[PDB]
Amino acid sequence: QEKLKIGVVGTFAIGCLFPLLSDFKRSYPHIDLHISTHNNRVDPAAEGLDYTIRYGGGAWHDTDAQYLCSALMSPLCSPTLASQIQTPADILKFPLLRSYRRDEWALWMQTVGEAPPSPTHNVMVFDSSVTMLEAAQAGMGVAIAPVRMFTHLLSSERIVQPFLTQIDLGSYWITRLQSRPETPAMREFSRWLTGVLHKT
């Protein structure tokens, strides 16, 4: 067995990778895959990772980055909050949930032709979209997050996407520190993942 150590942003692990892992096992049973999750703030060298799966723009320095898939974002909320939302302005009846990126709501509103929320609007800030969507399911506020990472919540009707409009503030990438040697197990995992994303 060849060891492969990968640190995966939790949102991607839950929303994409984990359901696909048995297919990886089918194709490459000889690889001993060690998966750990992170909240997108991670130091691969410190954790001794081979690969990091992360959300971003693909422009990390001293890093070999390969695009995995898009991460278009849109408002997401409980069916109960959705019942009170007919137009984008209605979102502001409720508190807003966002990531550590300060202008996500300003940018989405701007895109659909609305003014940004008031600087004193109730906002809660999340390190992980997984946690954010738990809060959204509870009706704590309206979230904005990568919709394709939450298909399980949409299909089970625990969350709703009230509007079609989506914005791109980043995608999912797999990255290797340029100083980290690329092994056969790494090449195989990377090929499998980019491949299986294209199929599905």
Contact residues toward a copy of itself (CB under 8 A) are 10, 13-14, 18-19, 21, 34-39, 41, 100, 123-128, 130-131, 134-135, 138, 140, 152
CB closer to a copy of itself, 38 vs 176: 38
Residue 162 — φ and ψ, nearest 5°? -70, -25
CA atoms within 13 A on the CB side of 132: 27
| Nearest alpha-carbon partner for 31 in 188, 151, 138 | 188
CB closer to a copy of itself, 39 vs 165: 39
- Least Å distance, CB 194 to a copy of itself, is 22
- Least Å distance, CB 171 to a copy of itself, is 20
- Least Å distance, CB 125 to a copy of itself, is 4
Run of H or E including 129: helix 129-137
| Residues 165, 111 contacting (CB under 8 angstroms) | yes
- Least Å distance, CB 135 to a copy of itself, is 6
CB closer to a copy of itself, 45 vs 164: 45
| Residues 189, 51 contacting (CB under 8 angstroms) | yes
